[PDB]
Every structure is written in C-alpha cells, then in structure tokens.
C-alpha cells in the first residue's frame, strides 16, 4: 500500500515503477498533493517530476537510496509550475541531469522556477526528437499540444501499462477543471485526446493530482474539456 516516508508518500505501481507524492499547504486551497514517478531501468533510476520543494525532492532522493540504492541517471519534468519543477535545485545539487520541454525552460524564470539543464524538442506529431532525449530507456516522451499549460508534456513507460499525464489529465470522477489562467482554452480538449491516442494501450493512467485511474480518466478529462470550447 501507501508508504509514508517523512511527509512524503510512495506507492509501488508496477515492478519497476513507483509513484512519489508530496504535499504543500497552499493558503486558500488546503494541503495539495502532487504525484510524480520513479522508474528503475536496469542499474539506474529515472525520475519524472520533482516534488513541490527542494527539501521534499531531496527526500525523494533519500527514499530512492534506501529502497532502490542505484544512481539516479536523469530526471524529466513535465512543465514549469512548482508541483513539477519546484525541486530542480535539489536535483542539480545531487548531480542529476535534468530535462524539460524547451518551452518549459524558456518559461521557467518568469514562472519562478529553475530551468532544467537540457531542453527537449518535439516533432510535429508530438514525439520527442530522439537526439534531445538520449539514454531515456523506457521513458517515451510526448508533447500532446497545449492544455493545462502551453508547455505540458507526458510520459509513457515502455514495458508497462502506465502512461503519465501530469497535470493535463484529471481522474474519471473529477468534478471540474477550473478557470486556471495558464490553460489553453482553445486547444485543451484536443491535447487530452492526443495523449490517449499516443499511448493507446496504457491501462493505468497516472496523473499529478489523483490516484492512478483507468483510461476513463482521459475520456472524462476530454469530455469535460469539450464544455469549455
Ligand atoms: C503559488 C501556487 C503554485 S501551485 S502549481 C500551479 C497552479 C496554478 C496549478 O496549476 N494547480 C494547482 C494545484 C492544483 C490543485 C488541484 C487541481 C488542480 C491544480 C493545478 C494543477 O497543478 O493542475 C499557485 O499558483 N496556486 C495555489 C494553489 C492552487 C490550487 C488549486 C488551483 C489553483 C491554485 C494556484 C492559484 O491559483 O493561486
Ligand atoms: O501545476
Ligand atoms: Zn501546472
Ligand atoms: Zn499540477
């Protein structure tokens, strides 16, 4: 089940895959959970998303050292907001190579984030340009179009039934999407559907602010995003 490690929660999702969860008390919004992923690829570990803070992200690295005890070869972060990139400095202090969408790196300063060290770029069809994502192992990175933000990216894990939608995807019982100022209202619905089509066989949809869900999370997020266009 859930594994409490200090103020963080870790949950094994598949043999080589764990979800990390961290919390931030946001005035006016309560204590908000954010989820990312940890993947073991042979003798190395790959991280998807930081925690909200540097201190929490250092604790993720501490958990990895205790439960896996292999080097963290790289981290990929899925857009320039605090839940996904708030802990970049902790990754850099630990010597970990970091990757984000070029657009996330461009937006990072004005969003109050530290940029990743390397920039991913994407083909017109959304798949990462392979030269920009060297040694990514099973991580299959896809840009579905603007939605939750202009720069949001998504990640499939080869050899598993898991795809990670980040903050683009909400769960199948979610009530709304909100009126968030960074969202692309014109394109959000198509981007959600493009994520589902990019990972057509993934049956476990992992996301930033809900527990893992079936593919109904995609249909429901899209079906909900329709009523904004
Ligand atoms: C200063 C703080 C940073 S929070 S990360 C960027 C947010 C704008 C955002 O996109 N959120 C926030 C968290 C969240 C919680 C539940 C559903 C959806 C979200 C969404 C996301 O990551 O998908 C900040 O900007 N805010 C604080 C908290 C918060 C909570 C919920 C909605 C908006 C916000 C945001 C604010 O509008 O002040
Ligand atoms: O976010
Ligand atoms: Zn966001
Ligand atoms: Zn989020």
Swiss-Prot record:
GO terms for biological process: antibiotic catabolic process; response to antibiotic. It catalyses: a beta-lactam + H2O = a substituted beta-amino acid. Substrate binds at residues 170, 179. Zn(2+) 1 binds at residues 79, 81, 148. GO terms for cellular component: periplasmic space. It is found in: Periplasm. Inhibits by captopril, thiorphan, dimercaprol and tiopronin. This enzyme is not susceptible to inactivation by the beta-lactamase-blocking agents clavulanic acid. Zn(2+) 2 binds at residues 83, 167, 209. Binds 2 Zn(2+) ions per subunit. GO terms for molecular function: beta-lactamase activity; zinc ion binding. Its main location: periplasm. Its EC number is 3.5.2.6. It is an enzyme of class 3 (hydrolase). The keyword Hydrolase applies. Monomer. Belongs to the metallo-beta-lactamase superfamily. Class-B beta-lactamase family. Confers resistance to the different beta-lactams antibiotics (penicillin, cephalosporin and carbapenem) via the hydrolysis of the beta-lactam ring. Does not confer resistance to the polymixin colistin or the fluoroquinolone ciprofloxacin. Enterobacteriaceae carrying this gene (identified by PCR) have been isolated in Sweden, India, Pakistan, Bangladesh, England, Scotland, Northern Ireland, Australia and the USA. The organisms they were identified in were K.pneumoniae, Enterobacter cloacae, E.coli, Proteus spp, Citrobacter freundii, Morganella morganii, Providencia spp and Klebsille oxytoca. In India most isolates were from community-acquired infections rather than hospital-acquired infections, indicating the gene is widespread in the environment. This is Metallo-beta-lactamase type 2. It comes from Klebsiella pneumoniae.
